[PDB]
Amino acid sequence: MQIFVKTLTGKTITLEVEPSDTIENVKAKIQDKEGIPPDQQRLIFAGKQLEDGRTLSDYNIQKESTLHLVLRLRG
Template sequence: MLIKVRTLTGKEIELDVEADNKIERVKEKVEEKEGIPPVQQRLIYGGKQMADDKLVKDYELEPGATLHLVLALRVAPSEIFSTSSRLEYPAL
């Protein structure tokens, strides 16, 4: 069945998917067309993020359905830092 994936820029990508395809496979098809690695993709349908291990049919997609693609920006471990739970203020 043909479905559409809409990017944040409004571009629509048409994909041919099977009901038994995992969402992971749908992301691979997006990568083939757009060059975006699956690990950086988040597919949204009906306001909910689609899980990689679920099947297309689990979401009851119909031909012509539109998924929304958002990019997941990963934070490198070196950019993560801890903060103290105690706030300190300089004397006024």
């Protein structure tokens, strides 16, 4: 399915995933097309932080759902 990831700069990256995909896979997908390390990633949806272990269906994330990404400050 197609979902959206809102980068803070304003740019909205589109992503192709599956409901069984893990949060660790999606960060790796965002890295793979935006270069941001998966550790510097924090995923937010419906006011909840997504955890690496769980999957997308665990949060009832459906098609064209917009996921918010927050950068954690770690140099």
